[PDB]
Short mmCIF file of C-alpha atoms and ligand atoms in Angstrom, two decimals:
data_model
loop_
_atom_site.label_atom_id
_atom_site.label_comp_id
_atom_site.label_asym_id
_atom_site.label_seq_id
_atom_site.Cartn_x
_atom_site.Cartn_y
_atom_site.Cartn_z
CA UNK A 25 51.57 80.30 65.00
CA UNK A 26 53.44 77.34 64.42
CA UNK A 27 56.18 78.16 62.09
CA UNK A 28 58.52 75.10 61.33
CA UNK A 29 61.27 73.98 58.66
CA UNK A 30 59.27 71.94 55.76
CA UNK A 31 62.21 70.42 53.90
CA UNK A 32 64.02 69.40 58.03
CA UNK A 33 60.68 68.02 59.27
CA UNK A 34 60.40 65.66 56.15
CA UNK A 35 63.48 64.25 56.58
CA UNK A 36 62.69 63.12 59.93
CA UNK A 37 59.50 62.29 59.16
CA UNK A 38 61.09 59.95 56.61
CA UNK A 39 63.89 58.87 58.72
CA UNK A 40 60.76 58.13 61.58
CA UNK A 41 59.18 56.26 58.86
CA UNK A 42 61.97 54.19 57.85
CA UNK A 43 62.76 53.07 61.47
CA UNK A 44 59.05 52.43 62.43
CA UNK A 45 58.85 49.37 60.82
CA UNK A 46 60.72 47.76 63.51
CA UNK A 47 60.45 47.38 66.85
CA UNK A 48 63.45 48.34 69.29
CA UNK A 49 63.40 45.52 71.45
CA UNK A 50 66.78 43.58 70.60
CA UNK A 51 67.93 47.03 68.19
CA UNK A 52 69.22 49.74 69.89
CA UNK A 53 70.23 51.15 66.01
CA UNK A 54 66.40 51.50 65.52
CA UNK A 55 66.30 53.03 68.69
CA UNK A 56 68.49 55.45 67.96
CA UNK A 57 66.90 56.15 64.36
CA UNK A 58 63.83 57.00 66.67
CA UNK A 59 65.52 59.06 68.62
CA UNK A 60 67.14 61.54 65.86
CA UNK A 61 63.91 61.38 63.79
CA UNK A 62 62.74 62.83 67.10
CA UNK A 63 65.15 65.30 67.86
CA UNK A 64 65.14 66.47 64.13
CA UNK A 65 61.68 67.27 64.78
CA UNK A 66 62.58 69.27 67.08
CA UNK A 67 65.28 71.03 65.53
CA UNK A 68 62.90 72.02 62.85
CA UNK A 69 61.10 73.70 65.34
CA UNK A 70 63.88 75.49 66.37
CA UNK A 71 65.54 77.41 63.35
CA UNK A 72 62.39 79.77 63.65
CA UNK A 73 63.43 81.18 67.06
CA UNK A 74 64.63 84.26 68.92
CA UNK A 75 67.99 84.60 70.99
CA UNK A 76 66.26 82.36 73.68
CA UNK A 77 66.00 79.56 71.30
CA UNK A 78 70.07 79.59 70.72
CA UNK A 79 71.44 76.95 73.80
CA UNK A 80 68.12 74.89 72.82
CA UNK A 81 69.49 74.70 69.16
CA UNK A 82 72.86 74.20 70.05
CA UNK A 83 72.41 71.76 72.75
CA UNK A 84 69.87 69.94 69.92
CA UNK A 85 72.42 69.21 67.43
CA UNK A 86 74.54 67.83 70.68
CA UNK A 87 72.17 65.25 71.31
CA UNK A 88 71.64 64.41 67.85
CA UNK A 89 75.28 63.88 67.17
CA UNK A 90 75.89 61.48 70.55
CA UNK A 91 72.80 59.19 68.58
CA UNK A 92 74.69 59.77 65.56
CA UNK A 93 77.77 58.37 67.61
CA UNK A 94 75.73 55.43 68.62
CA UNK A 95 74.40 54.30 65.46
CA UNK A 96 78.04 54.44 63.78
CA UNK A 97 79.70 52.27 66.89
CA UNK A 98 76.90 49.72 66.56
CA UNK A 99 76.87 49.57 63.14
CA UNK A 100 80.80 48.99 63.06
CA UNK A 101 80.48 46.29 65.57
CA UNK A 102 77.73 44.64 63.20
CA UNK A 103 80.23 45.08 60.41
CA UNK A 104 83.37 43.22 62.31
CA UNK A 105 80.77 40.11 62.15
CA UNK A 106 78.76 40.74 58.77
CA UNK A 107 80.53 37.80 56.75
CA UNK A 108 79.52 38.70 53.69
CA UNK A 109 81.73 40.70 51.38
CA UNK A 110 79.86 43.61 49.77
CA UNK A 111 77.22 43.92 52.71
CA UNK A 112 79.89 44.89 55.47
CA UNK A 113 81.53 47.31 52.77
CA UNK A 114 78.33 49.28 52.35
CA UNK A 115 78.09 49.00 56.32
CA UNK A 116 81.83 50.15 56.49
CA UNK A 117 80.61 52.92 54.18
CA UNK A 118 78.10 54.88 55.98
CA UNK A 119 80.25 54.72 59.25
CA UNK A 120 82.52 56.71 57.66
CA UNK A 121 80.26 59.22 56.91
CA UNK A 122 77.81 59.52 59.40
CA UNK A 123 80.62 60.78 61.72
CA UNK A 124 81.56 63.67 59.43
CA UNK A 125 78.19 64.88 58.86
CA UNK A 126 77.32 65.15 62.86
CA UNK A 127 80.20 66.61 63.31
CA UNK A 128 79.53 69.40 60.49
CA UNK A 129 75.74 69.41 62.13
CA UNK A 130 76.80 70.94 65.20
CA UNK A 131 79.16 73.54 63.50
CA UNK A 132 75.68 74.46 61.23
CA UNK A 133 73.81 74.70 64.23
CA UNK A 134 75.91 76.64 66.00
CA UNK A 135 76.34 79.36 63.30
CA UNK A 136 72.52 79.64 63.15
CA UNK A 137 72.10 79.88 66.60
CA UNK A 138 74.34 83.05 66.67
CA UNK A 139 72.17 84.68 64.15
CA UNK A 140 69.04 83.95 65.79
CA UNK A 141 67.14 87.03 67.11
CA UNK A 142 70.36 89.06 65.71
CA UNK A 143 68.54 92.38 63.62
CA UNK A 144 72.91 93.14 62.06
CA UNK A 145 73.20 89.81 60.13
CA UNK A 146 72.06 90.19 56.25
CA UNK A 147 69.24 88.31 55.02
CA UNK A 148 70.75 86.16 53.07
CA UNK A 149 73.44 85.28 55.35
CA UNK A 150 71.21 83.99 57.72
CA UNK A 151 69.16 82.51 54.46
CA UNK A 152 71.90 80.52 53.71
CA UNK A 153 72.96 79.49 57.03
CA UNK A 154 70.04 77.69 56.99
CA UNK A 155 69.81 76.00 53.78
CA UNK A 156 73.19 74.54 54.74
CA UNK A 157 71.50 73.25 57.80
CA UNK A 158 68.80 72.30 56.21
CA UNK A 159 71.09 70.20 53.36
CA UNK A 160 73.45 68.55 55.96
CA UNK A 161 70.21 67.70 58.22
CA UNK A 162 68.76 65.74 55.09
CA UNK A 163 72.07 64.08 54.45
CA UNK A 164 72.48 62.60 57.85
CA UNK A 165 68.41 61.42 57.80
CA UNK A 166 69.61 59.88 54.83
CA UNK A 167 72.59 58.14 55.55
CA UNK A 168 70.70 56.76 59.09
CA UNK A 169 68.10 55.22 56.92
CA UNK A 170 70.50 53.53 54.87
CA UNK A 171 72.76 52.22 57.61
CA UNK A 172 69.29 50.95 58.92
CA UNK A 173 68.63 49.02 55.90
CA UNK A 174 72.47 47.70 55.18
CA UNK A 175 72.43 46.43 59.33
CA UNK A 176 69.33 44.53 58.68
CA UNK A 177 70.46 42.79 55.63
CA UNK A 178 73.90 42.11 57.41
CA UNK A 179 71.71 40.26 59.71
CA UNK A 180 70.65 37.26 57.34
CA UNK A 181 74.49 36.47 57.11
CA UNK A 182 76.35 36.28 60.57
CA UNK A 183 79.47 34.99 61.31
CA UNK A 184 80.48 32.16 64.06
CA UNK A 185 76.23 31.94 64.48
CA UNK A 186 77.59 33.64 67.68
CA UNK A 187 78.70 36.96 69.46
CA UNK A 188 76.29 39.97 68.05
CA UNK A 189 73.17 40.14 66.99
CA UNK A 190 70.59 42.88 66.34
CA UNK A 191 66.37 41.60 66.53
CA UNK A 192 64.70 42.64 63.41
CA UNK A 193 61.40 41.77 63.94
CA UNK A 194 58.88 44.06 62.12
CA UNK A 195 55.85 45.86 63.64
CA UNK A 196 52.67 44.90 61.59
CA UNK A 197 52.13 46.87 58.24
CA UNK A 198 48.67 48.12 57.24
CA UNK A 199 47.88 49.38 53.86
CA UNK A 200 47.07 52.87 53.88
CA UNK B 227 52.85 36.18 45.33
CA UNK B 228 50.84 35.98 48.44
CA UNK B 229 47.00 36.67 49.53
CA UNK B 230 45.20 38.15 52.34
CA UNK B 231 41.97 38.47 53.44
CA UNK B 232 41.16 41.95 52.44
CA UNK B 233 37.55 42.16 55.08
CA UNK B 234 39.19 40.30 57.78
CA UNK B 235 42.72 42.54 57.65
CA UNK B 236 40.24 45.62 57.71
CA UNK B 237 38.58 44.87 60.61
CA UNK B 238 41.83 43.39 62.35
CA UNK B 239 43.34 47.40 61.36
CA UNK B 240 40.28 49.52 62.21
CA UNK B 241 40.75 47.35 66.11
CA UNK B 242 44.25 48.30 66.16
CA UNK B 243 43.19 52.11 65.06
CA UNK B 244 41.04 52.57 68.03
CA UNK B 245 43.77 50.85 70.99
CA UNK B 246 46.41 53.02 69.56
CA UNK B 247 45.34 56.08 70.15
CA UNK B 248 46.25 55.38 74.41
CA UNK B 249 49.05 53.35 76.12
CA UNK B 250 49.19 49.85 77.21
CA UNK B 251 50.43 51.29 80.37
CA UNK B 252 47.84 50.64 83.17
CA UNK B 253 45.77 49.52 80.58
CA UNK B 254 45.19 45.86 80.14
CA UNK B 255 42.09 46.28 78.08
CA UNK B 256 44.02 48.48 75.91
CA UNK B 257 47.07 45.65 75.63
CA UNK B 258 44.41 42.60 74.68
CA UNK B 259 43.06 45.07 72.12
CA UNK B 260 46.04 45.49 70.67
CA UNK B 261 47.12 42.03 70.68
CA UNK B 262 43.92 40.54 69.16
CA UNK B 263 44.17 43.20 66.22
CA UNK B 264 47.34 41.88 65.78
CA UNK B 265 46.30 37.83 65.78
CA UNK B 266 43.29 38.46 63.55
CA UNK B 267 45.87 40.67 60.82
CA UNK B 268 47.60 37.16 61.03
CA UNK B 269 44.44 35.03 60.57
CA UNK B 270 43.85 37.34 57.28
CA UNK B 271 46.90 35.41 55.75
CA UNK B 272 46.27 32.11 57.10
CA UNK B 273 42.55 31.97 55.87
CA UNK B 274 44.42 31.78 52.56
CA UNK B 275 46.75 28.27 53.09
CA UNK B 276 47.61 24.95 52.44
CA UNK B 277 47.58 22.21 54.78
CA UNK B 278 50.54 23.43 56.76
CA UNK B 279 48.41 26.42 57.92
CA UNK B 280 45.75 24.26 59.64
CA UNK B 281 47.56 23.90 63.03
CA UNK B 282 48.51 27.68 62.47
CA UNK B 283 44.91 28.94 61.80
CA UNK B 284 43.87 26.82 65.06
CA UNK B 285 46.70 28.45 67.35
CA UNK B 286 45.43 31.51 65.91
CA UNK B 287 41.89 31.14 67.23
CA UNK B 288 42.75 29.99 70.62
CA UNK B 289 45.08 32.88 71.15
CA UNK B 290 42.08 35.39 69.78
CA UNK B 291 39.54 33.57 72.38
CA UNK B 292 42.12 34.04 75.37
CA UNK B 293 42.75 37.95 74.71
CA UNK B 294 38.82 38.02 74.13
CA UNK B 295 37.84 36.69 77.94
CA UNK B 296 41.07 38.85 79.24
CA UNK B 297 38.87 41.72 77.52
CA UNK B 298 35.27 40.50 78.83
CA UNK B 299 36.66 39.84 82.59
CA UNK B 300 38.64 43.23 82.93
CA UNK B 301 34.94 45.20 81.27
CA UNK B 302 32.95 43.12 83.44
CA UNK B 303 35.40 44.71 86.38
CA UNK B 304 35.38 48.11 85.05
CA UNK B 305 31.82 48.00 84.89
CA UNK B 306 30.79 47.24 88.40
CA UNK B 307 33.76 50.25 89.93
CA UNK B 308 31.16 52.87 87.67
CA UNK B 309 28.42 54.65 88.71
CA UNK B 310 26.16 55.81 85.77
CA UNK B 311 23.73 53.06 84.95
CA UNK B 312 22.83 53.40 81.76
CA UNK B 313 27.28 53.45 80.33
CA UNK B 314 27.56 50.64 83.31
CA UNK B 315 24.55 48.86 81.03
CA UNK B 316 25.96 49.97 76.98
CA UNK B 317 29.14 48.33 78.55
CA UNK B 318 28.01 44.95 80.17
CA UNK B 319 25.77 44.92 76.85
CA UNK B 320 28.21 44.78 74.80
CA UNK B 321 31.09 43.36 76.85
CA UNK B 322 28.76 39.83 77.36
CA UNK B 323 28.48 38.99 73.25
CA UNK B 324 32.08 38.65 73.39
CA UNK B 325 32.97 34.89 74.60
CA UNK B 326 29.65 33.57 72.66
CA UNK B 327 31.43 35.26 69.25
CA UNK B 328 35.15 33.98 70.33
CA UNK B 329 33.75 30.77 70.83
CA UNK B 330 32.09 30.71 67.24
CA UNK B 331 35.28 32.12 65.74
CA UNK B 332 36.97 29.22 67.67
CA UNK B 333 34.02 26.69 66.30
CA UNK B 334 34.27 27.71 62.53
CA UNK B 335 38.03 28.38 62.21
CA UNK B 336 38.20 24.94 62.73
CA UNK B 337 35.77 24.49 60.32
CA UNK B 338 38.28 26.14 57.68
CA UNK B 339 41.11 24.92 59.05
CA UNK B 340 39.99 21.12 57.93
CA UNK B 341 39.16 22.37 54.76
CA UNK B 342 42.14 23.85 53.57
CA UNK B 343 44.27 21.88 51.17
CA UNK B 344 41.52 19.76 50.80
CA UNK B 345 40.76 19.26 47.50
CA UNK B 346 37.70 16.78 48.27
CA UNK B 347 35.27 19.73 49.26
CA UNK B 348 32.97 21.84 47.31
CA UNK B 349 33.79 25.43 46.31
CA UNK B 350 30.68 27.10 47.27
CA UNK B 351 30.78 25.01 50.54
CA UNK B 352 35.08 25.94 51.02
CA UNK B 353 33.59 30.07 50.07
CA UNK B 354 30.92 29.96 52.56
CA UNK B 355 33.08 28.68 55.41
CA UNK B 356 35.50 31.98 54.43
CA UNK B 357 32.68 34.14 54.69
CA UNK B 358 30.90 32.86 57.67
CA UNK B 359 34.47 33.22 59.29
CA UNK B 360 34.99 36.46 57.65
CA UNK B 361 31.43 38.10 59.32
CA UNK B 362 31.97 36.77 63.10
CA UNK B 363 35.96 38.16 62.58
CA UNK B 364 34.23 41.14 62.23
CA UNK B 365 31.56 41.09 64.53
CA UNK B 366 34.07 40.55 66.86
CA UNK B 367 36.95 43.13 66.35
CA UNK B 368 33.71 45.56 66.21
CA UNK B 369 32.71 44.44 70.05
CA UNK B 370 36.23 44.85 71.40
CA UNK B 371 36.01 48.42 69.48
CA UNK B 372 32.50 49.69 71.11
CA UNK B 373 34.20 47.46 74.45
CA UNK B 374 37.16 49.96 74.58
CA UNK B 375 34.83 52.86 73.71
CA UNK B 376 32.74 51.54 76.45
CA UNK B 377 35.65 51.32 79.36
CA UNK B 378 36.76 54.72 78.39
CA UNK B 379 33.58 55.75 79.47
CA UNK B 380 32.54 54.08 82.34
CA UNK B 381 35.90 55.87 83.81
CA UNK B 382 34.94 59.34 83.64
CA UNK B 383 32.10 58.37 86.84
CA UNK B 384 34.18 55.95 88.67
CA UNK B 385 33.45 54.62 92.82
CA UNK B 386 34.91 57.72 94.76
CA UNK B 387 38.30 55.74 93.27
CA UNK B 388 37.61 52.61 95.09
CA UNK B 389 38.95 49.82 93.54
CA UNK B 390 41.51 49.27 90.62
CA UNK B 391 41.02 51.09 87.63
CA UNK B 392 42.48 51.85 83.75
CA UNK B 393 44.65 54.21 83.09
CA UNK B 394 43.14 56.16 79.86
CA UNK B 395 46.14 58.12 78.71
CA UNK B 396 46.35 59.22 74.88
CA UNK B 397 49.59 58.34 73.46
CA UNK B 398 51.31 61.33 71.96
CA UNK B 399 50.95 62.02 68.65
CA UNK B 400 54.19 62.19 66.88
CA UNK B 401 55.21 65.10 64.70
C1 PIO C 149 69.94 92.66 71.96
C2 PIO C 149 71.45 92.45 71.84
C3 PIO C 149 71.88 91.07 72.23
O1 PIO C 149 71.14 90.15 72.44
O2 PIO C 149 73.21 90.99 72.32
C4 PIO C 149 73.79 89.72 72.69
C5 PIO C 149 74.30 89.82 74.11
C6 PIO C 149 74.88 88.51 74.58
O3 PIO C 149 75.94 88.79 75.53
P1 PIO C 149 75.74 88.38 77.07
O4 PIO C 149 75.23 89.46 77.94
O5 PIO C 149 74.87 87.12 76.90
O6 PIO C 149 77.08 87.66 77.61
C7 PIO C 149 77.98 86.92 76.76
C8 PIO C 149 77.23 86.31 75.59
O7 PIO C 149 76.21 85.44 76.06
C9 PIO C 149 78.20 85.54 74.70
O8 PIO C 149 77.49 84.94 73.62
C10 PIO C 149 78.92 84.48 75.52
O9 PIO C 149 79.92 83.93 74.64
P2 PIO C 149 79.77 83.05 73.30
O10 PIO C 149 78.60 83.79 72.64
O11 PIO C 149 79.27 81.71 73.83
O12 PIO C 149 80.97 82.93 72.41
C11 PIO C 149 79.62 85.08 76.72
O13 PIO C 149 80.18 84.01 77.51
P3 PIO C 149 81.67 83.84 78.10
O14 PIO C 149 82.54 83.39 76.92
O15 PIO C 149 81.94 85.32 78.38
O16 PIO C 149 81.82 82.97 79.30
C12 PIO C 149 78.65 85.85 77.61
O17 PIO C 149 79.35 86.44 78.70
O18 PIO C 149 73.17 90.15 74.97
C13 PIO C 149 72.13 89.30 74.98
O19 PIO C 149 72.07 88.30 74.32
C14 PIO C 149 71.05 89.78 75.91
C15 PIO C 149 70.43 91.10 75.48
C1 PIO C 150 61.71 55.38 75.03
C2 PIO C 150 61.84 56.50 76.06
C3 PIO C 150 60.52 56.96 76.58
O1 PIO C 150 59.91 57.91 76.16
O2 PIO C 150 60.09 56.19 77.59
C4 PIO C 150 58.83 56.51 78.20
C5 PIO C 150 57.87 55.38 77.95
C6 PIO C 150 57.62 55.18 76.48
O3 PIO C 150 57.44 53.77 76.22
P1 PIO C 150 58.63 52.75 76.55
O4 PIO C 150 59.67 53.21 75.52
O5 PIO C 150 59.04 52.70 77.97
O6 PIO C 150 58.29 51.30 75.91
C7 PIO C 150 57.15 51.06 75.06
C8 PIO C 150 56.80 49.58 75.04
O7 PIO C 150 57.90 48.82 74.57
C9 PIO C 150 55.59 49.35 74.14
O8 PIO C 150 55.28 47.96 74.09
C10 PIO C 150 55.87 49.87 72.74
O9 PIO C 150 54.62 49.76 72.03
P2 PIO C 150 53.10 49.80 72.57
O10 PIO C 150 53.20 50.74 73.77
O11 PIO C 150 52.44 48.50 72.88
O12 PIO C 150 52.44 50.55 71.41
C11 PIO C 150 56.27 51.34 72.77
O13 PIO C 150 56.63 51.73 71.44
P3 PIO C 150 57.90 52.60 70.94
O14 PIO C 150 57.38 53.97 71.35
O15 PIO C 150 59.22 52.26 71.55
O16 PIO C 150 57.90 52.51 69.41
C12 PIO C 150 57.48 51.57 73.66
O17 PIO C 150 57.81 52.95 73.71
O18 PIO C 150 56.59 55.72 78.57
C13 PIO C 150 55.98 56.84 78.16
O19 PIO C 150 56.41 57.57 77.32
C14 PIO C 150 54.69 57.05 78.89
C15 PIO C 150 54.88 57.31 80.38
C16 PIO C 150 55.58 56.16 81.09
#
């Protein structure tokens, strides 16, 4: 049936989450956040595949990384105007480490895709090639999330009231 | 450190529940619903005010009764291009209580809107003004509701596509 990666599809689901609670008109970082929430999704639809399922893993991780890319360079540029002290150093933080982590991703992703559909890999090799996956996949949901939440607040100081600004405008919350 | 009206949010949410399950896109029924679910969540809050939330609460209600004719006048249209009587008459039956319930939301949030801060008006007379409010609110987020319903219907039997009509496509669900 429909065999898909618990622990990668609830990271995205949280990352989707996070992001959902404001629109992207104005904030192409929340767009982006919607767009690897997205992709993770798929991804975790992907480690359960056969060798046919390899370039679509591969070229997954690809397109995750450029909207890693995307939310690091506009998070920077939110940074070089964030006037307050210990706001842009959290920022400055995660932009640091975002980078690193996509760029492990698509190593992962790569090294599962080889063993996909491959009957003379052991099973725990391919066990743990995986669960590394699966643990740098949840670290760069999380560090998203976060550089969602340290933008925002880097929003309520600016600096020259001029230059760059992201819209954080939320979409309407109903309890559930 | 801040109220809503619990009755009025829940019918405001269970309108926005039923428009976003299909896209805005060709859709202008779908867009008014969405936007009226979204100005009576608002109202919820401003029921519960001071005096700087009269002029709010008023805006409020004028904006409510324009998406609600938008909604009638786009029905009314998507009822005449269909062909089975008896959805074309469950949707101009239900479509045509609309402005007369806009109209007495825009009548007795007015009503409330005079009374709040006021501190020279009875209790009972300040709770029954809330609930009166409260019942038509939901009276008519339930319209719209059975209105959408309604125009989803009346597009299945449409006039050998003859004039312009909605675009009834079920937004993806995401996962
Ligand atoms: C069952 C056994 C089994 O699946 O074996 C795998 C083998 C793949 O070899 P295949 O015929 O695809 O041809 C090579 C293979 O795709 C390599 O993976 C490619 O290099 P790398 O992988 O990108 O480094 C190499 O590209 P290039 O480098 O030569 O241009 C290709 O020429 O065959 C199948 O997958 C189809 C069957
Ligand atoms: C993004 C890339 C993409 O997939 O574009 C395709 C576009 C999607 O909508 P598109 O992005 O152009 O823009 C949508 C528009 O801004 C709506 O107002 C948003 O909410 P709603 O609609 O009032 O609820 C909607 O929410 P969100 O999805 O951005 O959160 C926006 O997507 O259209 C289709 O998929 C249907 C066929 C055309």
């Amino acid at each position: 049936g429909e065999v898909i990666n618990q622990p990668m599809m609830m990271a995205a689901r949280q990352l989707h989450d996070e992001a959902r609670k404001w629109s992207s008109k104005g904030n192409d970082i929340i767009a982006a956040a919607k767009r690897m929430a997205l992709l993770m999704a798929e991804m975790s639809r992907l480690v359960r595949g056969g060798s046919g399922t390899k370039r679509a893993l591969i070229q997954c991780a690809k397109d995750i990384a450029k909207a890693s890319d995307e939310v690091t360079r506009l998070a920077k540029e939110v940074a070089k105007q964030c006037t307050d002290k210990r706001i842009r150093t959290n920022l400055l933080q995660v932009c640091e480490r975002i980078p690193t982590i996509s760029t492990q991703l698509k190593i992962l992703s790569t090294v599962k895709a080889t063993m996909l559909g491959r009957t003379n890999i052991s099973d725990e090799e391919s066990e743990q090639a995986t669960e590394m996956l699966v643990h740098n996949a949840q670290n760069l949901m999380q560090s998203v999330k976060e550089t969602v939440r340290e933008a925002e607040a880097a929003s309520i100081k600016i600096r020259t009231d001029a230059g760059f600004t992201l819209r954080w405008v939320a979409k309407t919350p109903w309890y559930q």
